[model samples]
Target: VKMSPLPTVENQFTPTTAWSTSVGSGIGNFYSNLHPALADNVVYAADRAGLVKALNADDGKEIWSVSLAEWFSKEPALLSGGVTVSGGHVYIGSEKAQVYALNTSDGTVAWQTKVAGEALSRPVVSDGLVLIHTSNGQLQALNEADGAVKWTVNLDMRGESAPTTAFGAAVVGGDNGRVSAVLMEQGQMIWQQRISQDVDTTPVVVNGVVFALAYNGNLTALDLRSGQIMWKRELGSVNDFIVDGNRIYLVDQNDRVMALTIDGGVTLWTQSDLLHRLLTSPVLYNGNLVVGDSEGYLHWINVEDGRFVAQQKVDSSGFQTEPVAADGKLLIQAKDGTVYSITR
Candidate 1:
């Protein structure tokens, strides 16, 4: 058997670690990679074992921690959905097909409810409604005040991306290579389109245009109102991406990061140096793009031309979720459960 060659990358800068700590029993392979969510002054994260923690955003100190498993009667909790902080509450879903809302100041379970399917993606909150895309082909709109179901609409296939809301609509991509747009108020169908083969990445809505990627090398741009394809390109990605102005930064299935024009799907630049590293999604902070890899290293690239700017090893356990930026710092979580707050 032959193996493909690894691409050569120029390592430029090294990152400065501000603070680092391990939270709970780090997520193992039995669940999805849960990313941390940052709100006003806290960084909220959860492990597969149901331990949710709120860390001080400025110093990485543990503010409070609680277990979701305790919500049930001695039953083990298996959480997979990443955290979503909104309206002074922390929203997360479970592989057990449950959604929980915790008080943001303290790790208290404000509300919990069983949905129709597993909430594999972050819940989107818009206009007093919490919109959840489930793995069982349903988009459920729940009242954020309590766990009451506002409405439930069937989608084309299983969903993995978080629902995008804008212009009085909620948009989602599914494994069936379809995109569906629905009314935010009533969960009514606005428009739908089949774009490619297996779209697991979340769609990015910028200025009323939606951009999504499929596993089979198709990147598409569609009109938000009418679901019309503005442009399509052959580029695959399984992770979420950052849309900065008119540019879309994404890592293809081959692990090559590239920047494309959002309107025309034109390739602005391709950085194949990190090919085959199994890169996570890219997060933009302070004009730079940061991403983690299967090798437990954080890579910073110039957002202007996709050049290597800096690199740092967080842990040997590697990273499976995308890095997030808040308050001029990058928060990265390793698969081993170590979270690092680094400054450029």
Candidate 2:
């Protein structure tokens, strides 16, 4: 795919960097769901080499750093997922079919467990259980305290999608062409609604609506309690999205940023100048949609019209995850493991 040319924009806000620092070796030239996880006014980040670090969100002070890589193993920890935090502990999964729990204050290992398959998605914490859906279609739940197996079930999905909890229900979608809602504690299937030819995006549930996007350019909204289709659309995205007010903001597979009505999947606007640039997911900072591209440029789009309002280059290695907001600053992590806290 050819990279799109940069769009022309008159600056609406100047992106000002407050602080920056590096974590570890980074996820260079690799596919990952790695992002800086914010909890308790701190940022947690991981690299492909198994190193995890904690930094103060107020200032880029290193709280601690630890390596989860096994001794004498040629393979890295391959921390393709996590840094997700809940209940004073952080969770991460690796390509080695392993999951590790660590303290949020320090990088101490709480527990480790071998899972059913490559746990490539961010582990979702819900009701005392840490749930991860692996590449092999197994939705396994482990005890949040000791990493013990609580319950497990096979969704029979083809690819891996991160599990998310919608109040009491666990929602997920993958290559099986459907999105499902399951009982979070028991792994009992509630309802499965076919949406497209393939689905690998995590479903976003809001206001009793389950919004799931398929990789094959289909997005659908289904009833949360029942597997009934409420609405459907042709827009598609594999990345996580932002839902603010009645608007759903996402960077489509083509890298065109769009704003669709959250209830009806109606297209309100589309920004196409960033097409095919491998943009990260859309995140809201100061009421604007911010997305980073493969060239390390962060573009801020207006919420009402989806026009480029501002742009800033944060790194040379680009970004893999959406910018996380913490303490009034947008924390953007480069693919090379460097984190920058920027503000207007």
Candidate 3:
């Protein structure tokens, strides 16, 4: 057999897949699955070492890094909250149960306020207020401009439910099989609903419905206004879920990706074996589902039929956090301190 001389492959013989030089080693030792914030051609990442670093988004070059050590610790500085960019500032929560506002341009600290509990999840922001839930099952609202306390409500439960915001209210789901939605303005309890299962996954709200998957293997939907149950279905060790339009997307602990109708929690389609165990939340971007596995492989699955599209693999670094999508790109950090950005 004779091989044809690589047929003049469009200015190249092979695809270019060179990774940028290591930007800053050991800047991150924490788990960061939150989608990175891209601003003015820069990308921002938070390290488990109580530091926040900014890098050139186009070339992965370090621009600046800020230390949060006074507010959090390196050992357990899990800033699990999803990063949100608003009013020229990037806001995130830390394991110290504090919310911080940093300048997006230079990574300078604007303000920090301790919420007095373990904030293991990302704080939810709406209007000018930010809602954060501590490990003690308390949801507190703070002013976005200065991190001043606005209101605090205790659920009196041991199950720590992360708080999410939608429609002038904050939706909180507990590990105790209970969910509550509080009015954003007055810190008043609007309503509470109970699920038969405990929840550790984040609640994603679309339109007027709140969707959540529980550790008890239940996928549930609730009416946002009145806190009433819409539907509940078992998916077997529900890990995480995301909603786009009328579709609710999820990844089970067994690496199955399922899409269902948001109206009543109906299954639309599913793609199994997308990961080994507990993959990151599958996010919808440009008509496709992108997720990172516990094995550090970023898999892109087709939303049409739940088929595999393209995949990029890394070393042994696994991902245990949900990914974020923004600014025409997808950014995710792994358990081994490797960060990736995929452009569609």
Candidate 4:
């Protein structure tokens, strides 16, 4: 990953790089990564230590902190997606099969509930329901008020990736390489379709279509309504997929980023030399595609050609996960509990 060495704005926006700043303590001796969520002017991340820390977006300053260790596992799940923030509260899941809603104005815990299984998957907030995929391969719809289970259904497979939504339903992918659509209101199965051999990537839905990549590099698109198979593209061992408008971005197991058409899966372009197995999903910001790796380096690829436009070295945050977007900046937390920001 590399950028223009000169001080000229080559693309749509100028880039401003920031440094790593620590916000919490008690980083596990093992890898601990933070997922970032944003609300109002505050940024939030949950440490492996079970403490959720809020920081000011404009400046890297801690706003407040609260601990989830009492109800969560000794370690938190790797962070993903935007914090499901709404109604003056921020919601996140823990590795110990617990979901928490915290008041945005204060660090106080609003509500916490225990799911029947581990909750490594991030919850998606949509259509007034919080869609959570439990580790036991069950999709549950719970009310935001008190974390009571509104509905639950067993997909009958070991869980794999996070769930995405469309038309009042959440799509659950199975570790066994199957995809199924469930109605959120009552947890009824709409249809089940086996799309991949091994599901490791999170599914992204756009325009009523669900997009997913597998550990084997198969990109499958399915109709969210009836579970009809739309198209499948084999790119050689992909596990990450991100959609921006009509274009889709993916990272192969070898760290290559490729852009393809959404309609028919035609090859658009690809960039090689990214070999760290990108745990973090690629970011689509201001037209540039960004992804971070286990090497502690962030790479910005051109959307037009999948070429490297810029690269920056951030902290290792061992066990790197997806980089999150907030206020036009990328919030990066190292496995060591160091937090940093980058702007473009």
Question: Model 2 Cα displacement at 128 (Å)?
Answer: 0.8
**In lDDT terms, how accurate is model 1?**
0.80
- Per-residue C-alpha lDDT of model 4 across residues 1-344, encoded as one tens digit per residue: 44223222234444555645564552445432236777787777766656677888878688888866645446544332235677777887766677888888887988877776766666777766777777667788878877788888887551136788777777877565778888777888888888765235567778888877654558888887777988887656775677877888877766667888878468798776665444466777666888776656677778987666776666655436567775677776666666677776
> How do the candidates rank by TM-score, highest first?
2, 1, 4, 3
Cα lDDT for residue 79, candidate 2: 92
Q: Judged by TM-score, which candidate is best? A: 2
**Candidate 2's residue-wise lDDT over 1-344, tens digit each?**
88888887889778877898897878888777778888878888889889999998878899998998874646578997677999989899999999999988678999999999998888989899999888887889899989999988888752237977887789888766777788976888998888885224788888888877775757788889897998887654545566778988776667878888887567898888998888887788888888888889899888999888999878888886767875677888898889888877
Q: What is the full ranking by lDDT, best candidate first?
A: 2, 1, 4, 3
Candidate number with the higher TM-score (2 or 3): 2
How well does candidate 1 score on lDDT at residue 85? 87
Better of 1 and 4 by TM-score: 1
Best model number under lDDT:
2
lDDT of each: 0.80, 0.82, 0.67, 0.68
Off by over 4 Å in 3: 1-35, 71-78, 158-161, 197-200, 275-277
Q: Which pairs in model 3 have colliding backbones?
A: 81-122
User: Per-residue lDDT for 1-344 in model 1, tens only?
Assistant: 22224334566655688887777777865447478888886888888888889998888899999987755467657787778889988999988999999999788888998999988888889999998888878999988989889999998552257889897899988667788999987888988898874235588889989988764557788999899998887544544566888788877667778887766457888887777777777888778888888788778889788887777777888887768887766898888777888877
